[PDB]
């Protein structure tokens, strides 16, 4: 469990099957997304836990661009265990560190 993986590496495993859970908020999903996740804010995690789709043997957790995802990593781990849980840097911090753009709504 809890492995705090660095960016670039996560872009590798996500392009293979690893899933990510957005334990942030739906008003952020409006503007930006992340490298392969699902909208499951804390309002779902505390009422049920990890969704049955993203329940694969290897998952990841993220929240905002620095909401200290590690600050609840104990609960987040249990919520998705026995699968392998990781933390993709400071959430959005990681994806952007390597310079990869999020799944934003294209405009001009």
Swiss-Prot record:
Induction: Part of the ygaVP operon, which is repressed by YgaV. The operon can be induced by tributylin (TBT), a toxic chemical used as a biocide and in textiles and wood preservation. Keywords: Cell inner membrane, Cell membrane, Membrane, Transferase, Transmembrane, Transmembrane helix. It catalyses: thiosulfate + hydrogen cyanide = thiocyanate + sulfite + 2 H(+). Its EC number is 2.8.1.1. Residues 1-108 are cytoplasmic. Residues 14-104 form the Rhodanese domain. Its main location: membrane. Sulfur transfer activity is inhibited by S-nitrosylation of the active site residue Cys-63. S-nitrosylation competes with S-sulfhydration and causes small, widespread structural and dynamical alterations. GO terms for molecular function: thiosulfate-cyanide sulfurtransferase activity. One of its GO terms (cellular component) is plasma membrane. It is found in: Cell inner membrane. It is a multi-pass membrane protein. The active site is at residue 63. Transferase that catalyzes the transfer of sulfur from thiosulfate to cyanide to form thiocyanate. May have a role in the detoxification of cyanide to the less toxic thiocyanate. May also be involved, directly or indirectly, in the transport of the thiocyanate produced across the membrane from the cytoplasm to the periplasm. The catalytic reaction induces conformational changes within the rhodanese domain, as well as in the transmembrane alpha-helices. Homodimer. This is Thiosulfate sulfurtransferase YgaP. It comes from Escherichia coli (strain K12). The lineage of its organism: Bacteria, Pseudomonadati, Pseudomonadota, Gammaproteobacteria, Enterobacterales. The gene is ygaP. The chain holds residues 2 to 109 of 174 of the full protein.
